[PDB]
Amino acid sequence: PFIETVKMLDARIQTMDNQADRFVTKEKKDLIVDSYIKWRISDFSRYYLATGGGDI
Amino acid sequence: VIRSDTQRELEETIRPYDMGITLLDVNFQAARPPEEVKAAFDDAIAARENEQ
Amino acid sequence: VIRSDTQRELEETIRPYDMGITLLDVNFQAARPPEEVKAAFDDAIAARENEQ
Known about the structure:
The structure is cut from a larger assembly and holds one copy of chain A (56 residues) and two copies of chain B (52 residues).
Chain A: E1 14-24, E2 30-39, H1 44-50
Antiparallel strand pairs in A: 1-2
Chain B: H1 2-13, H2 35-51
Function (chains B, C): HflC and HflK could encode or regulate a protease.
Subunit structure (chains B, C): HflC and HflK may interact to form a multimeric complex.
Organism (chains B, C): Escherichia coli
């Protein structure tokens, strides 16, 4: 107690949603795309390190 | 080809400096045209629809 | 077919997740056309009656 500290990194799959954004096609046709991405923490140590402070 | 050149060119720019910063990724975000000319860009598409 | 494909795709989409949600039924409700073109879609039917 008071010497060791524990950081809890979730192993459940995280869901990341992207807001509406504009994309340019090959014919300069502007499009409106709504998309989401889903990822999971693979290396809890590295993720915590890379994303310093384990902040989603 | 730009994200490859700008990433490579940026690295060459900081080679003489010798700084300890390391480049991880160069991810292009947006290339939207000027808002003033956006109006015409969409009209050109509407003209095709009007033609039909 | 749209309900069948959407149901099958939805299940395949959530297979990796491993969630405990189970799909019971996908009952398609409506596919009505845009309200802007609905007016003409209604006229097309009225035209048949006018023709007759």
